Design an enzyme around this catalytic site. Structure first.
Site, PDB file in Angstrom:
ATOM      1  N   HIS A  49       1.031  -1.673  -0.372  1.00 46.53           N
ATOM      2  CA  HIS A  49      -0.255  -0.155   0.017  1.00 46.53           C
ATOM      3  C   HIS A  49       0.724   1.233  -0.128  1.00 46.53           C
ATOM      4  O   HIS A  49       0.752   1.733  -0.961  1.00 46.53           O
ATOM      5  CB  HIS A  49      -0.868  -0.440   0.628  1.00 46.53           C
ATOM      6  CG  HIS A  49      -1.527   1.471   1.117  1.00 46.53           C
ATOM      7  ND1 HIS A  49      -3.017   1.691   0.384  1.00 46.53           N
ATOM      8  CD2 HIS A  49      -2.027   1.979   2.204  1.00 46.53           C
ATOM      9  CE1 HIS A  49      -3.127   2.724   0.647  1.00 46.53           C
ATOM     10  NE2 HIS A  49      -2.399   2.674   1.673  1.00 46.53           N
ATOM     11  N   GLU A  52       1.985   1.916  -3.563  1.00 52.56           N
ATOM     12  CA  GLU A  52       1.031   2.886  -4.241  1.00 52.56           C
ATOM     13  C   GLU A  52       1.479   4.235  -4.356  1.00 52.56           C
ATOM     14  O   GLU A  52       1.014   4.977  -5.094  1.00 52.56           O
ATOM     15  CB  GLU A  52      -0.705   1.698  -3.930  1.00 52.56           C
ATOM     16  CG  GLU A  52      -1.543   2.904  -4.682  1.00 52.56           C
ATOM     17  CD  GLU A  52      -2.848   2.261  -4.085  1.00 52.56           C
ATOM     18  OE1 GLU A  52      -2.791   1.521  -3.640  1.00 52.56           O
ATOM     19  OE2 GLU A  52      -3.640   3.408  -4.762  1.00 52.56           O
ATOM     20  N   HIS A  53       1.169   5.143  -2.767  1.00 55.90           N
ATOM     21  CA  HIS A  53       2.021   6.163  -3.116  1.00 55.90           C
ATOM     22  C   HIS A  53       2.928   6.282  -3.824  1.00 55.90           C
ATOM     23  O   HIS A  53       2.651   8.397  -3.006  1.00 55.90           O
ATOM     24  CB  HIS A  53       1.767   6.676  -1.624  1.00 55.90           C
ATOM     25  CG  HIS A  53       0.438   6.088  -0.349  1.00 55.90           C
ATOM     26  ND1 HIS A  53      -0.141   7.461   0.759  1.00 55.90           N
ATOM     27  CD2 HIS A  53      -0.630   4.847   0.392  1.00 55.90           C
ATOM     28  CE1 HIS A  53      -1.578   6.981   0.689  1.00 55.90           C
ATOM     29  NE2 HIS A  53      -2.159   5.375   0.955  1.00 55.90           N
ATOM     30  N   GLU A 122       5.450  10.435   2.954  1.00 54.64           N
ATOM     31  CA  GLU A 122       4.205   9.838   2.990  1.00 54.64           C
ATOM     32  C   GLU A 122       3.652   9.231   4.450  1.00 54.64           C
ATOM     33  O   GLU A 122       2.218   8.437   4.632  1.00 54.64           O
ATOM     34  CB  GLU A 122       4.499   8.977   1.806  1.00 54.64           C
ATOM     35  CG  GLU A 122       3.549   9.205   0.541  1.00 54.64           C
ATOM     36  CD  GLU A 122       2.571  10.308   0.258  1.00 54.64           C
ATOM     37  OE1 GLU A 122       1.570   9.762   0.331  1.00 54.64           O
ATOM     38  OE2 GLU A 122       2.867  11.418   0.288  1.00 54.64           O
ATOM     39  N   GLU A 129      -4.305   7.919   7.423  1.00 52.25           N
ATOM     40  CA  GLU A 129      -5.216   6.907   7.116  1.00 52.25           C
ATOM     41  C   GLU A 129      -5.938   6.006   8.016  1.00 52.25           C
ATOM     42  O   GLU A 129      -7.206   5.885   7.836  1.00 52.25           O
ATOM     43  CB  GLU A 129      -4.689   6.690   5.241  1.00 52.25           C
ATOM     44  CG  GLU A 129      -4.438   7.006   4.309  1.00 52.25           C
ATOM     45  CD  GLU A 129      -4.033   6.575   3.335  1.00 52.25           C
ATOM     46  OE1 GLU A 129      -2.825   5.951   3.453  1.00 52.25           O
ATOM     47  OE2 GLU A 129      -5.224   6.243   2.697  1.00 52.25           O
TER      48      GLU A 129
END
Lengths: 438, 85
Positions: A49, A52-53, A122, A129
């Site tokens: 994940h 992906e960022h 990030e 999140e």
């Protein structure tokens, strides 16, 4: 009759699959990868994940800003998602902007910077999140459902990963993950809409030819999950709506019971009080629930993975004193898949599904998603003729036999969120998985 | 002071996650030997005085009373019995 899905390979083992539609003017090209969170261990859980960022944070050629501009100049957009077993990166564009989009996708996958400065930036975004998924109740429920059903196993882990990992993921771990997993024999380049197959194969030879091949190339969609009957209760009296999921271990993509499980799921079906037609649906559960105001909605599901699945139902209700009735009537409808279903229910569900499996494929993105999913789970796109034949082969005997081995008197995984005081304990729920009268 | 399912009369609950596993997935007698020996010993040791003290006191009282009564109704206890009545 839809146009034929063309399929080619490169030498490295990258599959190219396309389905043209000369009636549209837009195309969806992208890369479906047979890899996801399930490929992480406990220490690097969250890496897929995280990547992906960072795929969007700049490459060796284009900086983050240049990347933004290049896509803006294309006219379309890029999108990505990571699941437990699949990763997708795609680009929707105009017909003649397809070579640009393939080039950008090839760049962000193969040549991403993963600069320490961007990792560190990030690391906060992702940390935030963790505290905002909390609002997406369906996702909270399904993530707890996987965590408990596949307790302490790779399918049970979250995609985001624990807070601790988010703080310790390095560019090294990121690089190692994408080097081990994003190999040519696990990837499919998919085009749908206004794409020429032969054009797409040339673009693949231009951009994706220097992709690593894995040492041991297994076929696409190659995987042992041990389901745990269990429950998670997340009671919150301040929430007005209860969200409940109940599931049993279901079927994998390549199970012989895959279509039987879909037909059984269609017999129970979905319901939503806000849709006008839902009060008139044929499903028995739908009739009970609507007549008695037991729920705002329910949605049957049959989720598949490479080597297991979850089959069950997701319910939402404001009727907090009749949650017991809602659960009771739902599980008594499941019992009837074992004891009572006849050709009446089975032939009705088959009719509904024969169309349903085709209707879903509307726009180019849905078609691309269908080609990509089928190629990465089954190794081929299954023609609608084959699908029609497999559905037709499902008899009432097959449904009863499947339900008797999968549902009847079996352990469930159960997640309840919200005002669930009225949800009885595990035993009383699990006792509804059989009928004493039968 | 008690409602019913769905409105039992609890103050609002929030923030507790509860977890358990199916009776078919669990060993019902897991840890039975440890429980039977060490848990029972702990629980018994901590309550022993509350049983022993009153039982031992009232048994002593009874023993003394019953022995005296027996002695008063022997030959030897004639005189003491005469006084006691």
């Amino acid at each position: 009759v839809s146009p034929k899905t063309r399929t080619s390979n490169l030498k490295n083992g990258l599959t190219i699959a396309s389905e043209s539609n000369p009636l549209v003017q837009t195309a969806t090209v992208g890369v479906w990868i047979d890899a996801g969170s399930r490929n992480e261990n406990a220490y690097n859980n969250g890496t897929a994940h995280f990547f992906e960022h960072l795929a969007f944070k700049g490459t060796d050629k284009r900086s983050q800003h240049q990347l933004e501009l290049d896509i803006e100049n294309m006219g379309g957009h890029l999108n990505a998602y990571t699941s437990r077993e699949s990763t997708v990166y795609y680009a929707k564009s105009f017909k003649d902007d397809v070579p640009k989009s393939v080039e950008i996708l090839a760049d962000i996958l193969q040549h991403s910077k993963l600069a320490e400065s961007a990792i560190d930036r990030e690391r906060e975004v992702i940390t935030r999140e963790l505290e905002e998924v909390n609002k997406q109740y369906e996702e909270v429920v399904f993530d707890h459902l996987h965590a408990t059903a596949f307790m302490n196993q790779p399918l049970g882990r979250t995609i985001l990963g624990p807070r601790e990992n988010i703080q310790t993921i390095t560019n090294t771990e990121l690089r190692k993950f994408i080097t081990e997993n994003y190999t040519a024999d696990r990837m499919v380049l998919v085009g749908a809409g206004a794409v020429d197959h032969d054009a797409l194969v040339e673009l693949a030879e231009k951009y994706f030819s220097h992709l690593p091949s894995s040492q041991s190339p297994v076929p696409l969609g190659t995987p042992i999950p041990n389901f745990v009957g269990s429950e998670v209760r997340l009671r919150d009296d301040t929430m007005p709506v209860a969200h409940i999921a109940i599931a049993v271990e279901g079927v994998s993509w390549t199970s012989e019971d895959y279509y039987t499980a879909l037909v059984a799921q269609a017999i129970i079906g979905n319901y939503d009080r806000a849709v006008g037609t839902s009060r008139h649906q044929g499903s028995r559960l739908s009739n009970i629930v609507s007549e008695n105001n037991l729920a705002n909605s329910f949605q049957s599901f049959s989720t598949s993975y490479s080597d297991t699945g979850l089959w069950g139902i997701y319910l939402t209700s404001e009727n907090t004193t009749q949650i017991d009735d809602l659960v009771h009537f739902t599980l008594k409808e499941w019992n009837r898949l074992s004891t009572s279903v006849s050709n009446l229910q089975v032939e009705r569900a088959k009719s509904q599904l024969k169309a349903g499996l085709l209707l879903s494929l509307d726009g180019t993105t849905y078609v691309a998603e269908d080609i990509g999913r089928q190629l990465t789970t089954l190794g081929r796109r299954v023609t609608p003729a084959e699908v029609e034949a497999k559905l037709e082969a499902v008899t009432e005997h097959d449904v009863r036999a499947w339900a008797q081995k999968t549902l009847y008197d079996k352990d469930i995984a159960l997640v309840g969120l919200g005002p669930i005081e009225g949800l009885y304990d595990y035993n009383r729920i699990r006792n509804d998985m059989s009928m004493m009268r039968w | 002071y008690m409602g019913w399912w769905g409105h039992m009369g609890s103050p609002p609950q929030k923030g507790i996650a509860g977890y358990t596993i199916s009776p078919f997935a669990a060993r019902p007698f897991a840890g039975v030997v440890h429980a039977a020996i060490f848990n029972t010993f702990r629980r018994t040791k901590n309550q022993a005085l509350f049983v022993i003290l009153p039982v031992s006191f009232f048994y002593y009282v009874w023993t003394q009373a019953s022995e005296k009564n027996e002695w008063l109704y022997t030959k030897a206890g004639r005189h003491e019995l005469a006084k006691a009545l």
